[PDB]
Amino acid sequence: GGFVLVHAGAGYHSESKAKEYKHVCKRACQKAIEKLQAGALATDAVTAALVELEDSPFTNAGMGSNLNLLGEIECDASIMDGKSLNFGAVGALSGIKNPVSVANRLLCEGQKGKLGRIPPCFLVGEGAYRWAVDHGIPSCPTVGAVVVDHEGNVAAAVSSGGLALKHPGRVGQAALYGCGCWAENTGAHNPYSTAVSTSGCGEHLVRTILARECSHALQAEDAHQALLETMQNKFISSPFLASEDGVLGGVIVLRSCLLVEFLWSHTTESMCVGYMSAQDGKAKTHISRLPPGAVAGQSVAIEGGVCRLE
């Protein structure tokens, strides 16, 4: 058993890049499924999906990331495990092919605890590079995913190259706890295991701590209405973003209990998603677009479905 949902290229609809996004979202889902069918942890499955998403030269993450003001690459990525509730993140990272690998490495090391000090969950800049290299992570010469395994464990990750020409050192939502992604297994105050991954305007997602907000709203009965209400009230109409002339963001959501309800929503013109069940064979891709006449950054688009795992 196992299910996976991924996203790439949220933003303005490209009647050309669309084909490319579908392609990589297809194989990102394939790799995630492979991992799960090989009995891998949900975090390694979501990590494998991100590596594939990052490696596509068309995605603003890993290889092909946007160059900053100095024509340099600085990447943000993070990952969260719903079972352990642990998290790993890197910000303004360069020199590493797959930022999500550094984040996942920080997560695993974090799960080992003081076995002789509380481990770091968030590293940035040169220090993040040295740390990655020191742990064997391949030093060179927005995308995301949510996963749930046969046991019902969930995981989420997000990776981005951030804004083109951004000032050096600028860190976005993909590196920030609660903002870029979230994953939380069922608990006393969490009737559902939920996983979230975001995309869009970094600052907008950060100010509203969107990822975590969606996870909390999703504890309600109606997943569809829960997400819609969040995108409308907690995002578009958030007082924290009142000064903004348009709110741009996208999110993919997974909720289980195995009954898996998966959804995606965005205020951007469009967003590409790919999803697959381990007992489904072949991933499905889809270019989600805002309804006709809907204004980007002022309206919402939401689609989804259900899936039963075994």
> Closest approach of Cβ 250 to a second copy, in Å?
17
Kindly report the number of other CB atoms within 10 A of residue 165's CB atom. 12
| Candidates 25-33, 169-177, 260-268, 287-295; binding stretch for a second copy (CB under 8 A) | 169-177
Handedness of CA 122, 66, 271, 246 (dihedral sign): positive
Structure tokens of 55? 């490696």
Pick the piece of the chain touching Cl ion (CB under 5 A) from 6-14, 222-230, 233-241, 274-282. 6-14
Which one of residues 4, 6, 8, 231 is an interface residue with Cl ion (CB under 5 A)? 8
Give catalytic status of residue 142 as yes or no: yes
Residue 169 binding result from a second copy, Cl ion, none, given CB thresholds of 5 to 8 Å by partner type: a second copy
Between residue 110 and residue 139, which ones bind a second copy under the rule CB under 8 A?
113, 117-118, 120-128, 130-131
Contacts of 105 (CB under 8 A, 6+ apart): 88, 132, 135, 137
Count the residues in the chain.
310
* Among 17, 14, 87, 52, CA closest to 276: 52
Q: Which of 55, 11, 10 is nearest to 31 (CA)?
A: 55
- 253 touches a second copy by CB under 8 A: no
In sign, the C-alpha dihedral spanning 238, 241, 242, 244 is negative
Under 8 Å CB-to-CB from 248, ≥6 apart: which residues?
A: 11, 200, 201, 204, 267, 268, 296, 297
- Which amino acid is residue 26, in one-letter code? K
Residue 8 binding partner per list Cl ion, a second copy, none, with a CB distance cut-off of 5 to 8 Å that depends on partner kind: Cl ion
Per-residue mark of binding to Cl ion, 42-71 (x: CB under 5 A): -----------------xx-----------
Give the interface with a second copy as residue ranges (CB under 8 A): 74, 84-85, 87, 91-92, 113, 117-118, 120-128, 130-131, 163, 166-172, 176-179, 187-188, 201, 203-204, 206-207, 209, 212, 239-240, 242-244
The residues annotated with a catalytic role in the active site are 142
